[PDB]
Amino acid sequence: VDPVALYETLDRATDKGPLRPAQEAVLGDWFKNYGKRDVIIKLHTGQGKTLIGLLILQSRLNDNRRPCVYLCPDNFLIEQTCEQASQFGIKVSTVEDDLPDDFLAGKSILVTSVQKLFNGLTKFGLHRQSIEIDTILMDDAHACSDRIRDACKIKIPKDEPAYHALFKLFSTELELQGVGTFADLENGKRDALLPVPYWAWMAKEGEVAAILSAAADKKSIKFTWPLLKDRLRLCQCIFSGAALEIEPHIAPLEDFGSYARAKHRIFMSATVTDDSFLVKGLQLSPDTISNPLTYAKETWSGEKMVLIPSMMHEDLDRAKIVAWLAPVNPKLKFGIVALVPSFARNKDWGAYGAKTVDKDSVSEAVSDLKKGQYGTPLVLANRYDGIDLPDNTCRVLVFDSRPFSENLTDLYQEHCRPESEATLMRTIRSIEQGMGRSVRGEKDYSVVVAIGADLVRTLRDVSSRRYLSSQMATQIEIGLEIAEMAREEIAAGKEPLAALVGLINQCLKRDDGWKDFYADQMKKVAPKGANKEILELYSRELAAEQAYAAGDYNRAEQTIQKLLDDGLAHPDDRGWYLQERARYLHDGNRVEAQKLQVAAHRNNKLLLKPPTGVTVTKLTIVSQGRTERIANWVNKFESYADLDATVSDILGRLVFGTKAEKFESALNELAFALGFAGERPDAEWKEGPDNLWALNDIQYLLFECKSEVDTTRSEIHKRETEQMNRSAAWFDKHYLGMKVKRLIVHPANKIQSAAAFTHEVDGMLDSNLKAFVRSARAFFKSFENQNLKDLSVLHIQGLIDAHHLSVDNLINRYCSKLKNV
Ligand SMILES: [Ca+2]
Ligand SMILES: [Ca+2]
Ligand SMILES: [Ca+2]
């Protein structure tokens, strides 16, 4: 009954000692207070999660409270859990073919992956047929939440016939949400993304149901269709040239009666990771999130030296660190592990000799590093959960660039809501999960080198710093202080790479001064609770979604309206909730639905465009006061470090070979940065140019962004010329009387024989765009050692005249004449 007393009665191995104080305190707190239906245990990594879970579930089994089940997010953790249970003398069983009879009889703890429980053809049963479970414990609840989310999604790749069937079904309504993006979809670009709107989705529920039912024999639909077959009106559909994803807004956790009707639910997660995501992912009340079971005497655990070399010198960019750490070095006595956001960035690390591994070969490479194969650096792409690197297995973890999600839904919300709460919290959660893998013990120490301009912007931005955990924020601040001190050292004549190597040596050689400095500085961490406003916002969102799922549209609409009126929503994030009301009222009251959809499109133009009632508004700016706008935009920043981080992020993305979406967003941000006003009519107004800059009252810059085109291509295809002709026609239709410089951002100079331009269009080659980026970087570098809040207007005008960023300079200096073949 008592788990601390139960620990002594086990036939444990000889090398297993007594309970740690944190483990014993958590067990005592659990036995005293729960011996409430939901509970979250937050603790540091390496505290013995498996031991605590097995002890709690064995104690629950001892009271004839059966069955009790431990879930792992993956199969490696299944093997580790069963091995450790064999060490501790606790009998466990696994689901080989069918459910164990000992598990049903309540004789042993069931250890299973979260995929076995959460799937459409599960052996635990669905709806009323679900096999009853008393106590269920979840380890690493955020990874399990991600796996539960991925189990409820339909992803159909291009090569299946279902993708072409659904594309033929939805081509008419996908074309109205963007014309250039539709041409990218027809060519199969992975980066291309188009949503199917709600009005087309509920009106074509039967056809999509028939198409998906016709392809139930495929692997991608067989295990997901029974959950979604009777709730297609609640889903959303996103198309990309590699795959199409259909996902419900909230996961159907009510169908899983073994989990939803469970008598006790214990959740385990990291201390640094914010448990605000569990409101929607796992459908918890905020009371359990705001009241976790933690060790009272618990402090910071483990040693992390989070270095940011981009703060140290201008030469210490991402490329220098990549060229320094990637190539093989046989004299190293420890592993070097790099975390990159995609397989595209495996090229830069792997060109120097680093070992790049795919999804299936991560575990083999990690196990090889655990055996002492420290010669070759290891690169891991977009997978941080489930990886353990204790002690000598990794002493140099490298974090490359801002991590991005593989889900089309999250990419779409990143496209529409860049500065919202949820997107920033997801990115910060991914950053913290990736950064905490290198340290697993209370003694273990590591250097985490975080590079890439976008990652540093995420770590510096004032809106994004407030969501970081206090431990990780204080570690970043220690890195900032050491970076400033070593910057002063480099200003005294020290070589930058030499200073970085010296600091890494100070951490790795166990210097006493660094230990004293870390012990003194770390004392400032106050363990932050979950933010109550964000929890209340998510609770209202979940309540409205459940109200709409039950057929009560008016309750959901009033819930979203009360959410808007109480001020919990961000002022720039109003329009999303307006769209939510417009989607909830679509069946009930179509006129009010169209009114709120038009309101949502006016408030946030990146959202879905209704076919009627939207009028194109001319982007207008005044000629005078450009320098005042530049001064105000720079005046938003507190110090030169934030401005340099933001400018380096924006101008790093203006290179060929990057994604088209990132290039267009960076160009719009640079439009605002230079005192202009920019818009993206293909994404905002769903037709026309990819970017438009309002330089002054009468002059505009029109861009046709072709960033994905390889630099070695020497001809302009017919489809690109047709796209630029359509953009020019749209601008001549909606902006009569305005001068414009039509620019096509393309590496090629020559035009194909079958292709032609209807208007005068000039190209931006690679050298011209590089010169433009150099001019912008030299312009924003000139604000160094200047007072940001007292910028002189004449000084800014002089900098504009010096760096060739005037209106005529933008029109004429940064373009090249194209040649016809
Ligand atoms: Ca386009
Ligand atoms: Ca675009
Ligand atoms: Ca394109």
**Residue 478 to residue 400: CA distance in whole angstroms:** 20
- Cα(660) to ligand 3 centroid in Å equals 6
Ligand minimally distant from the alpha carbon of residue 663 = 2
In a domain, 297, yes or no: no
In a domain, 773, yes or no: yes
Q: How many residues does the chain have?
A: 821
Ligand minimally distant from the alpha carbon of residue 683 = 2
- Cα(691) to ligand 2 centroid in Å equals 8
In a domain, 428, yes or no: yes
**Residue 638 to residue 635: CA distance in whole angstroms:** 7
- Cα(83) to ligand 3 centroid in Å equals 52
In a domain, 526, yes or no: no
Q: Which residues of 655-680 are buried (b: 16+ CB within 10 A; e: fewer)?
A: ebebbbbbbbbbbbbbbebbbbbbbb
In a domain, 295, yes or no: no
Are the CB atoms for 744 and 704 separated by under 8 Å?
yes
- Cα(711) to ligand 2 centroid in Å equals 19
Q: Which amino acid is at 214?
A: A
Stretch (H or E) spanning 115: helix 114-117
Judgement on whether residues 505 and 587 belong to the same structural domain of the protein: no
Boundary of a domain, candidates 571, 603, 635:
603
Burial class (CB in 10 A: 0-12, 13-18, 19+), 686: buried
- Cα(706) to ligand 3 centroid in Å equals 6
- Cα(759) to ligand 3 centroid in Å equals 20
| Ligand 2 (single-atom ion) residues, CB below 5 Å | 660, 664, 690
Instruction: Give residue 538's domain range.
Output: 532-603
**Tally of domains in the chain:** 5
**Residue 394 to residue 397: CA distance in whole angstroms:** 6
Judgement on whether residues 376 and 476 belong to the same structural domain of the protein: yes
Judgement on whether residues 130 and 213 belong to the same structural domain of the protein: no
Boundary of a domain, candidates 572, 603, 634:
603
Q: Which residues are registered as beta bridge partners of 156? A: 244
Other beta carbons less than 10 A from residue 593's beta carbon: 21
Any idea of the CA torsion for 745, 749, 755, 757, to the nearest 10 degrees?
A: 60
Judgement on whether residues 450 and 550 belong to the same structural domain of the protein: no
Judgement on whether residues 57 and 157 belong to the same structural domain of the protein: no
User: Is the bond preceding 390 in cis, omega lying within 30 degrees of 0?
Assistant: no
In a domain, 19, yes or no: yes
Judgement on whether residues 8 and 31 belong to the same structural domain of the protein: yes
Q: Which residues are registered as beta bridge partners of 39? A: 266
Boundary of a domain, candidates 234, 264, 290:
290
Other beta carbons less than 10 A from residue 620's beta carbon: 10
DSSP helix/strand/coil, 317: coil
Tell me the CATH number at 731: 3.40.91
**Residue 381 to residue 337: CA distance in whole angstroms:** 11
Q: Give residue for tokens 């591994």.
A: 357
Judgement on whether residues 791 and 649 belong to the same structural domain of the protein: yes
Which of 413-418's residues contact partners 24+ apart within 8 Å by CB, and which partners? 415/193, 415/606, 415/661, 415/683, 416/576, 416/604, 416/606, 416/607, 417/573, 417/576, 417/604, 418/665
Q: What is the Cα Rg of the chain in Å?
A: 28
**Residue 508 to residue 394: CA distance in whole angstroms:** 11
- Cα(578) to ligand 2 centroid in Å equals 25
Other beta carbons less than 10 A from residue 247's beta carbon: 23
Stretch (H or E) spanning 214: helix 205-214
**CB neighbours of 493 closer than 8 A, spacing ≥ 6?**
none
Q: Which residues of 157-172 are buried (b: 16+ CB within 10 A; e: fewer)?
A: eeebebbebbbebbee
Q: Which pairing describes strands 303-307 and 355-356: parallel, antiparallel, or unpaired?
A: unpaired
Quick one: three-class SS letters along 352-395?
CCCEECCCCCHHHHHHHHHCCCCCCCEEEECCCCCCCCCHHHCC
Which of 585-588's residues contact partners 24+ apart within 8 Å by CB, and which partners? 585/553, 585/557, 586/198, 586/199, 586/202, 587/202, 587/553, 588/553, 588/554
Q: Which residues are registered as beta bridge partners of 243? A: 157
Judgement on whether residues 119 and 259 belong to the same structural domain of the protein: yes
Backbone discontinuities in the chain, residue before each (C to N > 2.5 A): 35
In a domain, 430, yes or no: yes
Other beta carbons less than 10 A from residue 52's beta carbon: 25
Judgement on whether residues 143 and 160 belong to the same structural domain of the protein: no
Are the CB atoms for 403 and 437 separated by under 8 Å?
no
**Residue 493 to residue 496: CA distance in whole angstroms:** 9
Ligand minimally distant from the alpha carbon of residue 415 = 2
Q: Which pairing describes strands 243-248 and 691-694: parallel, antiparallel, or unpaired?
A: unpaired
- Cα(188) to ligand 3 centroid in Å equals 11
DSSP helix/strand/coil, 157: strand
Ligand minimally distant from the alpha carbon of residue 687 = 1
DSSP helix/strand/coil, 274: coil
- Cα(780) to ligand 3 centroid in Å equals 29
Judgement on whether residues 386 and 469 belong to the same structural domain of the protein: yes
Tell me the CATH number at 508: 3.40.50
Cα of 42 vs its chain's centroid, Å: 23
**CB neighbours of 728 closer than 8 A, spacing ≥ 6?**
702, 742, 758, 759, 761
In a domain, 806, yes or no: yes
Of the chain, the end-to-end C-alpha distance in Å amounts to 85
Judgement on whether residues 500 and 592 belong to the same structural domain of the protein: no
- Identify which of 699, 661, 721 has the alpha carbon closest to the alpha carbon of residue 178: 661
**Residue 679 to residue 685: CA distance in whole angstroms:** 9
Judgement on whether residues 184 and 260 belong to the same structural domain of the protein: no
Both tokens assigned to 322: 């990549």
